[PDB]
Amino acid sequence: AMSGPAAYASYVVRGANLVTAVSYGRAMRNFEQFMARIVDHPNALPSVE
Amino acid sequence: AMSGPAAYASYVVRGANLVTAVSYGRAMRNFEQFMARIVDHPNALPSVE
C-alpha cells in the first residue's frame, strides 16, 4: 500500500506568460514567482524553507 | 503663438517590463496596454477610432 497524488499537476500559459509567448517567442514556468522576487523582494537571499 | 507640451514623455521599465528585461534579453514598450489586446480581449479587429 502507498499513497500518492491522483492527478497530474496542471501547467498552463496564462495572461502574463501568454504575452511573452506570442510576442517574444519565449515563455516561463510560473511567472508569478519570478515577478514576486525580482521586483517585490529584490534583496531576499535564497533560503531553503 | 502655438500650444505644445511642457515636458517630455516618460517611459519607465517598472513593473512587468522589468521581469522580461532581466530574465530574457528584451523589453516591451507599454507592456500593460499590449497585454489588454492579446489576453484580456482577443479577436478584436484593429479600428482607428
Side-chain angles (χ1 to χ4, degrees), chain B residues 16-40:
Chain B
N17 286 111
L18 198 148
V19 177
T20 67
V22 170
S23 291
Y24 304 115
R26 293 184 187 174
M28 290 305 299
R29 180 176 178 87
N30 291 116
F31 184 82
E32 192 268 329
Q33 186 62 254
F34 193 82
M35 181 180 73
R37 180 70 67 191
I38 297 171
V39 69
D40 186 75

Side-chain angles (χ1 to χ4, degrees), chain A residues 5-43:
Chain A
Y8 295 98
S10 67
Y11 176 57
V12 65
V13 278
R14 289 180 182 179
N17 295 117
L18 195 146
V19 179
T20 65
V22 168
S23 302
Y24 298 126
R26 288 173 69 91
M28 186 168 61
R29 181 69 178 88
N30 211 169
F31 184 82
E32 193 270 328
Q33 186 56 250
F34 283 87
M35 186 177 72
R37 192 179 293 272
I38 297 171
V39 73
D40 286 333
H41 293 89
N43 52 3

